[PDB]
């Protein structure tokens, strides 16, 4: 086996494995080299045959089309937000309230 490098664009790549479908649960997905975190939901959008994935105003990935099936999948990240505590003075009481 002889290898030549730094001379031509790479086209003989190794084998890449694949996983199973997921729905309504955010995961650290990877679609054709595009990585990210978000849920996988059914999309009502319409694409063109040369389009791979979509984008929005905020320069973020929004819709990803899997190569296995022609139907497209939307991308929405996990439910993120701050957490706040609602408490009285420690000299008065001890109980606390959790605010999301």
């Amino acid at each position: 086996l002889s290898f030549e490098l730094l001379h031509a664009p790479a086209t003989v790549c190794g084998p890449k494995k694949s996983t199973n479908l997921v729905k309504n649960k955010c995961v650290n997905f990877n679609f054709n080299g595009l990585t990210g975190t978000g849920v996988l939901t059914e999309s009502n959008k319409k694409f063109l045959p040369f389009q791979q994935f979509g984008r929005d105003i905020a320069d973020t990935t929004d819709a990803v089309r899997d190569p296995q099936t022609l139907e497209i999948l939307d991308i929405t990240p996990c439910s993120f937000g701050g957490v706040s505590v609602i408490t009285p003075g420690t000299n008065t009481s001890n109980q606390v309230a959790v605010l999301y």
């Binding site: 905020a58 973020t60 990240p77 993120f80 937000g81 701050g82």
Partner: peptide, 22 residues
């Protein structure tokens, strides 16, 4: 609401979270 303030309201139209006003 008054008609004037309602008309004014109708005329006026990651990791980032926008807190709602009190």
């Amino acid at each position: 609401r008054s008609p004037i303030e309602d008309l004014l309201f109708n005329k006026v139209t990651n990791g980032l979270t926008v807190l709602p006003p009190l």
